[PDB]
Homo-oligomer: A and B are copies of this chain.
Amino acid sequence: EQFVIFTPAGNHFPLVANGVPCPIYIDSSEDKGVMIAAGNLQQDILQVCGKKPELLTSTSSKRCIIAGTYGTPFIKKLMSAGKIDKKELDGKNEKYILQVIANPCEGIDEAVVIIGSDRRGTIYGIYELSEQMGVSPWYWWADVPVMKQANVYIKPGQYSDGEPAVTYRGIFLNDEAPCLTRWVKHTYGTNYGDHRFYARVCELILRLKGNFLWPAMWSWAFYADDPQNSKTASEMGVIIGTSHHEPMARNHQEWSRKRKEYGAWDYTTNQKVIDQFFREGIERMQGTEDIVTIGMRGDNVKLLENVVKNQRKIIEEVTKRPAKETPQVWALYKEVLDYYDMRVPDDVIMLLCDDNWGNVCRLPNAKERKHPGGWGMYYHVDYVGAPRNSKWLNVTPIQNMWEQLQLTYDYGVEKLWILNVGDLKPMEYPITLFMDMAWNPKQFNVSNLLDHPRRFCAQQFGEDQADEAMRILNLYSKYNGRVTGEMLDRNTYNLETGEWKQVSDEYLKLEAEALRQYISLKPEYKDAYKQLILFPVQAMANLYEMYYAQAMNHKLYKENNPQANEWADKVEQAFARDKALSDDYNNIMSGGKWKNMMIQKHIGYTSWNDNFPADTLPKIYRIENPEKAVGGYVFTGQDGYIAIEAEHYYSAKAAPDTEWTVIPYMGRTLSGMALMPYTQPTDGASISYKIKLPKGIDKVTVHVIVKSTLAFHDRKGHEYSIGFEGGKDQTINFNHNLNELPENVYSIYYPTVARRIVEKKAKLNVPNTSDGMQTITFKPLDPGIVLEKLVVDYGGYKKSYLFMNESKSKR
């Protein structure tokens, strides 16, 4: 299926040789659609080789590219002379055959020859040649650059994508304010989508091998905003439709814009105007391949069957042809689905719908499977509705989309697949997976699934970047699948179990890995990578840290712990950084080409809809007078252990001329506590910790971690006592053996001081307090002792380099 090589070879056609492209010939009996594709091919080749190939007016070159459509007299007298059999394109749908051939017609020696089964086959073939040459369908829509080549050669043999398994394959631009609309404003100057915009949309669709579009309908009217809209799609080869709730080829806004004049949307009071409304739409779309939405809602099963009948009679009257000859779609959404369980005319495409969240609701049984008109599926990657919007980023696991669409195809649904793509961006990858599956759902299985994004990343970022990029794409997709950014908040994950820490840290790890890849990019890929990997990863990693930080702020605040203050700072930074990321995306990235494409509000949802005016700061509490909020900690032992950071003491008594001092960051974990200054004696000085232990425990082992200070004042060493109030003390010398004497030097000395701490264990007795509360007092007996951590082991301590996670506390 790969027919382009970038190095010369025998019995291969020199399309581009040593920087010189052969010309292009399109016979003039070819639809305007082919001439466009061919003009784009011409520019695509200019992109790859540097020199513009000439669009021939006649058969005036020895080697060239020819592209044509089956059924032409010219193509017939080429297929005939010769070799290419008729059966291979006769009555085939949207197929092409691409084949190097001598000697195609008199004035020519040899040519690469693309022949379509119909115009879209021919267009699809042209773009295949263009894509295998390195022009990604996303060269404009995602700034993917064109890998330059001095030599392009085409393999011998016959090359096809066959027939598309799904008859109509398209996208729906929807939920398009404010992002898409304000982008279109910035780019085109228009308060609607005009033909310049839709040319861009149609080309993407076609280059993706797609063939269908539901144009934007929230505030615009495709048919009525610009006479050239229809003319543009129809001449290029894109079939227009309208959404399930816009019957008879009228755009919903055509009615709304004139609500006051036309009156109610109700068939039992305003039938005549509505019939005329329907009628004018069917007239407007004559001579396009457009598909017609039937049915009606709002403002009995009998009433509806009668609307359809009338709609069909209106179709018959305008077309002067039986209804069955106008493509029609009827949607099974809401009540109309219940009704179905209802007389539906044989020829109509019956359109099923997903649950708005990527899971299919209902599929046809074997009896329904043989409904002549076929079945369609309406699938979502964006959504405005319950339980909360998903308007912001891509939230679709590659696996989900895959799993539900192979199911859909397998249950016979193969007439029409339409994907709600929001603002188009940032759904570039899921769009592509949708089109490729729509072409052939049986080209995929569990084994090879991830090859598709691998190809995608190879195509978007060069082969050397493909694997790493694909890994990041697949993961970020999966992470975003867990919870949308709109429904993410401080409660989504479990703080207590370290779940929230694990998912925050993991997303930041991915951010790290995406930045590695990003700075390793040849600069002409930086934009496409930011758009398709870097930004979604950065934006959501940052969001996750924000709510993580919000969660920590609340837990800590309720614990009267002033560490809440730092977590508040963090919330504010992430909130700032969120706006910072999108400003880069709108104004800086790609020269600000995509201004307004990333302005969707997502922080401040207290509801299903984005009712709130702007992105707003998530509630944070600050502890007043942190400097003075020290001491008072009480720990609650759990899982057989109490890990305590020196600083979280209950009460403390200093020696005269000393102040117990917090040395932040000191040691392996939180901080160090030390009597200061070091010149004064430590007599009478103590520091205490309040804990709850299960009652009955009478003997515990306590680990005391101190900075590995050496015997600097006195050859004996440093000593301290550790003990329970109401129990016997133990006095420990921790550094007497820590010196260069032969029996200490490599046995105990250096192995200790390299690792900067001294840990000693004490087997202490615990008094029988009736409420389980205990107080452990530590007394430094010599100067310059820095206490870092205590661990009360009562059966659960597990030897850990940082001496286990700090236990539950409050002040």
Contact = CB atoms under 8 A, between A and B. Distances in A.
Interface stretch (A41-49, A272-280, A425-433, A503-511): A503-511
Nearest to A518: B519
Contacts of A484: 754
A496 B800 CA distance: 10
A446 B668 contact: no
Interface string A524-543: 00000000000000000100
A730 interface: no
Given A388-B754, A740-B337, A509 B505 contact: yes
Given A386-B745, A387-B750, A450-B664, 19 more contacts: A338-B741, A341-B715, A355-B710, A356-B750, A362-B711, A362-B712, A397-B665, A398-B665, A403-B674, A403-B786, A410-B678, A410-B679, A482-B802, A494-B800, A496-B798, A499-B800, A499-B804, A508-B513, A509-B512
Interface in A791-811: 798-802, 804
A710 B387 contact: no
A686 interface: no
A443 interface: no
Given A362-B712, A740-B335, A801-B499, A784 B665 contact: no
Given A407-B784, A801-B499, A661 B519 contact: no
A355 to B, nearest CB: 5
Contacts of A474: 665
B361 A712 contact: yes
A335 to B, nearest CB: 6
A756 B358 contact: yes
Contact of A512 (B403, B501, B508): B508
A746 interface: yes
21 contacts: A359-B708, A359-B710, A360-B710, A361-B710, A362-B710, A363-B713, A365-B713, A386-B751, A386-B754, A397-B665, A399-B672, A407-B784, A411-B678, A446-B676, A482-B668, A482-B801, A493-B801, A497-B800, A502-B802, A503-B801, A505-B509
Residue among A388, A498, A666 having the largest count of chain B Cβ atoms under 10 Å? A666
Interface of A: 334-335, 337-338, 341, 355-363, 365, 385-388, 390, 397-400, 403, 406-407, 410-411, 446, 450, 474-475, 478, 481-484, 487, 492-494, 496-499, 501-503, 505-506, 508-509, 511-513, 515-516, 518-519, 541, 639, 661-666, 668, 672, 674, 676-679, 707-713, 715, 738-741, 745-746, 749-751, 753-756, 784, 786, 798-802, 804
A712 to B, nearest CB: 5
Contacts of A798: 494, 496-497
B334 A740 contact: yes
A332 to B, nearest CB: 10
Contacts of A494: 798-801
A329 B185 CA distance: 79
B496 A498 contact: no
**9 nearest A-B residue pairs (beta carbon):** A512-B512, A386-B750, A505-B505, A515-B515, A494-B800, A508-B509, A387-B750, A357-B753, A399-B666
A251 to B, nearest CB: 25
Given A341-B715, A754-B357, A663 B399 contact: yes
B804 A497 contact: yes
B664 A756 contact: no
A80 to B, nearest CB: 44
A679 B411 CA distance: 7
A659 to B, nearest CB: 10
Contacts of A483: 755, 801
Nearest to A541: B512
Contacts of A679: 410-411
Contact of A493 (B390, B712, B800): B800
Contact of A519 (B359, B519, B713): B519
A796 to B, nearest CB: 10
A800 B491 CA distance: 10
A386 B26 CA distance: 81
Contacts of A754: 357, 386-388, 390, 484, 487
Contacts of A786: 403
Contact of A739 (B361, B403, B508, B784): B361
Contacts of A740: 334-335, 337-338
A446 B672 CA distance: 11
A798 B398 CA distance: 29
Contacts of A800: 493-494, 497, 499
A3 to B, nearest CB: 31
A362 B755 CA distance: 19
A666 B449 CA distance: 12
A519 B515 contact: yes
A674 B361 CA distance: 19
Contacts of A499: 800-802, 804
